C-alpha cells in the first residue's frame, strides 16, 4: 500500500463527492419531480434537493432564491391521452396560439433585460444612436417571404443587442400597417428577400405583439420566439 495507491484511492473518493455536489447543484430548477397530474412524485431519486441559495439581482430587481416553490403561472391547454404515464399530452386547441409544445413560452418577467448601466439591452436601430450595418446584406427594405413563397411584409428596422453589438430581431411591417419582430436566428437574409421557413405568410400576423414600440420584455421575447419555432411543426401543411 504505497503512496501512489493511497493517492488514487483518495481521488476516487474525492470524485464521488464532487459528482454528488455537481448533481445537487443542477437540481435547483425543475425539482421536485412531479407526477403527470402535478402532484409530487414518490420516487425523487437518490440525490436530495440542494439548500437554497440567493442571487441579488442588479438594478433593484429583487432577489432570486432557488430552489423554491415552482409555478408555471399560465394555463396549459393540453390533455392526457392515456391512463398510464409516459404518453404524449395532446393540445386541446390551437397549439401555436395556446403556446404549447414547440410553441411553448415561459412566464418570464414582463420587463426588458438591462445592460450593465441599467439601460435597455435591446433597442430598435432607429433609436440606437450611432448603430448601423457594417458588413453583410442590409435587410431593411427587403420583402419578407414565408414558407408558402408568399410575401408577408418588408423589413423596416433591426433590433440590436447594444452591449454585444449584434442583431437579434427584424422588425417586419405587415400588409395591414402593424409590425412584428422576427428572431434573427430564424430568418435567411438573401440578396433580394428575407426568407422565413418557419412560418407561412398568413401566420406572421399571429406573432405576439409588443406593447411598446421601442422596447421588448423578456416575456414578449419568449412568446415571440416560441411562436416562430412552433411554426416548424404546426405550420408544416403550407410548407412548399
Amino acid at each position: 500500500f504505497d503512496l501512489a495507491s493511497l493517492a488514487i484511492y483518495s481521488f476516487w473518493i474525492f470524485l464521488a463527492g464532487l459528482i454528488y455536489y455537481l448533481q445537487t447543484e443542477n437540481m435547483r430548477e425543475g425539482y421536485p419531480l412531479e407526477n403527470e397530474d402535478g402532484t409530487p412524485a414518490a420516487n425523487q431519486g437518490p440525490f436530495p434537493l440542494p439548500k437554497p441559495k440567493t442571487f441579488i439581482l442588479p438594478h433593484g430587481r429583487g432577489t432570486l432564491t432557488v430552489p423554491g416553490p415552482e409555478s408555471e403561472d399560465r394555463p396549459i391547454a393540453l390533455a392526457r391521452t392515456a391512463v398510464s404515464e409516459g404518453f404524449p399530452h395532446a393540445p386541446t386547441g390551437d397549439p401555436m396560439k395556446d403556446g404549447v409544445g414547440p410553441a411553448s413560452w415561459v412566464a418570464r418577467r414582463d420587463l426588458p433585460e438591462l445592460d450593465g448601466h441599467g439601460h435597455n439591452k435591446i433597442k430598435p436601430m432607429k433609436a440606437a444612436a450611432g448603430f448601423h450595418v457594417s458588413a453583410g446584406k442590409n435587410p431593411i427594405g427587403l420583402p419578407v417571404r414565408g414558407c408558402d413563397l408568399e410575401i408577408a411584409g418588408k423589413v423596416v428596422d433591426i433590433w440590436v443587442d447594444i452591449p454585444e453589438q449584434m442583431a437579434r430581431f427584424l422588425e417586419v411591417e405587415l400588409k395591414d400597417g402593424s409590425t412584428r419582430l422576427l428572431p434573427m436566428q430564424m430568418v435567411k437574409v438573401q440578396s433580394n428577400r428575407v426568407h422565413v421557413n418557419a412560418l407561412s405568410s398568413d401566420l406572421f400576423a399571429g406573432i405576439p405583439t409588443i406593447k411598446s414600440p421601442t422596447e421588448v420584455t423578456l416575456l414578449e421575447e419568449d412568446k415571440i420566439c416560441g411562436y416562430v419555432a412552433g411554426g416548424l411543426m404546426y405550420a408544416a401543411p403550407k410548407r412548399k
Partner: protein, 300 residues
C-alpha cells in the same frame, strides 16, 4: 435553415468602453480598431486593455524569457539567418546536466541560460496569475478564473520546478524547444514504464476527452436554443426562459438527466481543471514514488 455559426448581418456602433466598478481607469488603453473579420464569428471590437504594474511586469518578464531562448537559438545557428529558419524547430535550450544537481553554478552554455530563462518565465506566469485575480476583483466578480488558472500552473510547476527539486536535479526539467520538448515527453514515458498505466494519466485523458465532449454538447446546445436567446445565460439563470427549459429537456429525454443554466458551467469548469489537476499528480509521482508504472500496475 440558418444555423447561426456565422453572423449574417454585422452591426456596429460606438465603441464599448466597458464597466467601471473599481477599475483604475488610468491604466486602460484607448479603443482599438474594429475587425469585420472577427465580426462574422464573434465581437468585432478590439480593446481596450488594462495595463497595470503586474501586466507590465508580466509582459516585460515574458519577453525576457522569449528573448533569452532566442539569442540561444541564434547562437546555435552560428548567427546565420538561413540556418536559423532551417533548424528553428530543432534548436533547444536544455537544463543543466545531472552533475550540477540543484546548483545555480552551471555555466551559461551548460544550463546556466536555461535557469535564467526559467526565472523570467516564473515571474511572467505568477505575475499574470495575480493579474487574473485583481482584474476580477476590481469588477467585484468571483475568482473562479484565478482558481481555474492555478490548475494549469500546478502541472507547469510540477514539470519544471517541483518534481526536479524532489528528484534533486534540474536536468529532470523540460527543455525549451519545439521538437526537443516533444522528445522529452516521449522519453519520460519510456523511462517510467509506459504512462498509459499511470492511473492519474488515464484520468487526465478521460477529462481531456471529456472537455471536448462537454464543450461540443454545451456549444451545440446553446446554438440550438439561440433562437430563444439561450446564450444570454446570466439572465436565464436569474429568470429561467424557454431556452433553458428546452435545453434541459433535450438532454433529460436523451440520457435521463439534465443540468441547469448555471449548473452546466460547474460541470464545465471541473471537467477542465481536472485535466491538469490529475496530470500534475501523475507526473509528481513518476520517479519520486513509482519507477515503473506498468510494473506498479500489475500489483493492483
Amino acid at each position: 435553415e440558418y444555423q447561426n455559426i456565422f453572423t449574417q448581418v454585422q452591426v456596429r456602433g460606438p465603441a464599448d468602453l466597458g464597466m467601471t466598478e473599481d477599475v483604475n481607469l488610468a491604466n486602460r488603453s484607448g479603443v482599438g480598431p474594429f475587425s469585420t473579420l472577427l465580426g462574422w464569428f464573434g465581437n468585432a471590437q478590439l480593446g481596450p486593455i488594462y495595463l497595470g504594474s503586474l501586466g507590465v511586469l508580466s509582459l516585460f518578464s515574458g519577453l525576457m524569457w522569449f528573448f533569452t531562448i532566442g539569442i540561444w537559438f541564434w547562437y546555435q545557428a552560428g548567427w546565420n539567418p538561413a540556418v536559423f529558419l532551417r533548424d528553428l524547430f530543432f534548436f533547444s535550450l536544455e537544463p543543466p546536466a545531472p552533475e550540477y544537481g540543484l546548483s545555480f553554478a552551471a555555466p551559461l552554455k551548460e544550463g546556466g541560460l536555461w535557469l535564467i530563462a526559467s526565472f523570467f518565465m516564473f515571474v511572467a506566469v505568477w505575475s499574470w496569475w495575480g493579474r487574473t485575480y485583481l482584474r476580477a476583483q476590481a469588477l467585484g466578480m468571483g475568482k473562479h478564473t484565478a482558481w481555474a488558472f492555478l490548475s494549469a500552473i500546478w502541472l507547469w510547476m510540477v514539470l519544471g520546478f517541483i518534481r526536479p527539486i524532489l528528484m534533486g536535479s534540474w536536468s529532470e526539467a523540460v527543455p525549451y524547444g519545439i521538437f526537443s520538448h516533444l522528445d522529452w515527453t516521449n522519453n519520460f514515458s519510456l523511462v517510467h514504464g509506459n504512462l498509459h498505466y499511470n492511473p492519474f494519466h488515464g484520468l487526465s485523458i478521460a477529462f481531456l476527452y471529456g472537455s471536448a465532449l462537454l464543450f461540443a454538447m454545451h456549444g451545440a446546445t446553446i446554438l440550438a436554443v439561440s433562437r430563444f436567446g439561450g446564450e444570454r445565460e446570466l439572465e436565464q439563470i436569474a429568470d429561467r426562459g424557454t431556452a433553458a427549459e428546452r435545453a434541459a429537456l433535450f438532454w433529460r429525454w436523451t440520457m435521463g438527466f439534465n443540468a441547469t443554466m448555471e449548473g452546466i458551467h460547474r460541470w464545465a469548469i471541473w471537467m477542465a481543471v481536472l485535466v491538469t489537476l490529475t496530470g500534475g499528480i501523475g507526473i509528481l509521482l513518476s520517479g519520486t514514488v513509482v519507477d515503473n508504472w506498468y510494473v506498479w500496475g500489475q500489483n493492483h
